[PDB]
Amino acid sequence: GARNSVLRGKKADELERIRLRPGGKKKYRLKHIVWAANKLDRFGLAESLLESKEGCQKILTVLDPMVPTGSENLKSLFNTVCVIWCIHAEEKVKDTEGAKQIVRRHLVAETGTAEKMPSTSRPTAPSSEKGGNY
Ligand SMILES: CCCC(=O)OC[C@H](COP(=O)(O)O[C@@H]1[C@H](O)[C@H](O)[C@@H](OP(=O)(O)O)[C@H](OP(=O)(O)O)[C@H]1O)OC(=O)CCC
Numbered sequence: 553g554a555r556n557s558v559l560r561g562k563k564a565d566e567l568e569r570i571r572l573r574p575g576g577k578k579k580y581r582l583k584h585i586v587w588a589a590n591k592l593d594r595f596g597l598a599e600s601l602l603e604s605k606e607g608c609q610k611i612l613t614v615l616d617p618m619v620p621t622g623s624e625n626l627k628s629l630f631n632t633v634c635v636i637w638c639i640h641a642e643e644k645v646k647d648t649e650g651a652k653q654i655v656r657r658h659l660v661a662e663t664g665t666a667e668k669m670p671s672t673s674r675p676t677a678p679s680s681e682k683g684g685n686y
Contacts, residue, residue, distance in 0.1 A: 558603065563639060570648065574650075604640065641658070
């Protein structure tokens with residue numbers, strides 16, 4: 553675009569506040585948007601799809617399964633697309649991880665009300681398995 557750019561004023565704050573990592577010091581910036589939008593065009597996806605939250609949902613759905621079966625060059629874009637959606641859905645996130653959760657919870661909710669119910673689970677092991685911070 554061009555008219556007052558794409559990013560807003562009040563929104564630019566929260567956007568510039570979000571950090572790429574939970575324990576890092578890097579914050580999202582136009583630089584990351586260019587690297588992301590540039591990937592879509594090349595891959596085959598459009599760029600305007602990053603403007604509408606609805607379009608972003610069609611992207612995360614494809615990159616979703618690409619995470620557990622793809623390279624880092626892809627997972628990187630998947631992390632950004634998750635944040636772009638949180639910006640248009642008025643969703644607030646502290647870091648990139650938080651955005652990945654909120655978005656996911658919103659997708660599984662739509663892809664879990666037709667015929668994709670969860671299966672039986674298993675109890676924890678007797679051995680020592682207590683290691684993890686909040
Ligand atoms: C010329 C090659 C360099 C290049 O292209 O640069 C890649 C660009 C910016 O550079 P970077 O800060 O090194 O990249 C990110 C940080 O190291 C972050 O700490 C790491 O952790 P997490 O966020 O995953 O926890 C990210 O991992 P993946 O998401 O890739 O696994 C990594 O991408 O990545 C972006 O941020 C773009 C938007 C996602």
